Write a protein that binds this ligand. Structure first.
Ligand SMILES: *[C@@H](O)[C@H](Cc1c[nH]c2ccccc12)NC(=O)[C@@H](NS(=O)(=O)c1cccc2ccccc12)[C@@H](C)CC
Length: 220
């Protein structure tokens, strides 16, 4: 595979969003991956509605601000026959009744693909598909305060993931410890967190924080 990938340079990625005080990370991860695959198909990048997913994908297993999964969101888009744009169905950071309107649907999918639980497989997917939805263990103060560099948390779990994010690429940079590889990850905590809303997470370090343990993307 390539040694470095960044889908932002190819037009696949919307600006960083902010989920607010609502456990809807799974919906931001899902819209990020679908934004990328829709752009791959149509050449048009359109921001998609996380609120549509929060309010409407309960029947697929999601629980609004109380948690969810990207695959359940991809299934909703397929079952429902569409997903509204961000502009038409804006984000409110609280669960409400479903207000989906098919007239304003701008995305579709025909299912999804789950990636094997190996960083080598995640790398192949990122290199060939586009941005990939992943789940990570983000439950450490070091993640809240991250500013720059490669994030490595010795107490991170590869089995207890609690936060959905989007891998938009990978790369390397020289470091003190010579652990130089990273996943380029888009978060949904606004642009004031991290590096403009992004984090470089340790790559090829025993599946650090579980980044390869629940990776998937929608089929468009
Ligand atoms: C991210 O904003 C969100 C925060 C959140 C809300 N509730 C919980 C409970 C445990 C951990 C994290 C939580 N995280 C998630 O949605 C996660 N999904 S989950 O599989 O841990 C999950 C937790 C609670 C309820 C439900 C309901 C349906 C499906 C899943 C869950 C992460 C892993 C998303 C990638």
């Amino acid at each position: 595979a390539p040694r470095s990938v960044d889908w932002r340079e190819k037009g696949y990625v919307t600006p960083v969003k902010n989920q607010g005080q609502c456990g809807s990370c799974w919906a931001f991860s899902a819209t990020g991956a679908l934004e990328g695959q829709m752009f791959r198909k149509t050449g048009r990048l359109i921001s998609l509605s996380e609120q549509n997913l929060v309010d409407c994908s309960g029947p697929q297993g999601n629980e609004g601000c109380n948690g969810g999964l990207m695959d359940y969101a991809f299934q909703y888009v397929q079952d429902n026959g569409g997903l509204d744009s961000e502009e038409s169905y804006p984000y409110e950071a609280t669960e409400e009744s479903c207000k989906y309107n098919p007239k304003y649907s701008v995305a579709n999918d025909a299912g999804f693909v789950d990636i094997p639980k190996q960083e080598k497989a995640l790398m192949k997917a990122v290199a060939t598909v586009g941005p990939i939805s992943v789940a990570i263990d983000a439950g450490h103060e070091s993640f809240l305060f991250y500013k720059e560099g490669i994030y490595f948390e010795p107490d991170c779990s590869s089995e207890d993931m609690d936060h959905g994010v989007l891998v938009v690429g990978y790369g390397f940079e020289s470091t003190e410890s010579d652990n130089n590889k990273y996943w380029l990850v888009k978060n949904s905590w606004g642009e004031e967190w991290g590096m403009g809303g992004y984090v470089k997470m340790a790559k090829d370090r025993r599946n650090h924080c579980g980044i390869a343990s629940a990776a998937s993307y929608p089929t468009v």
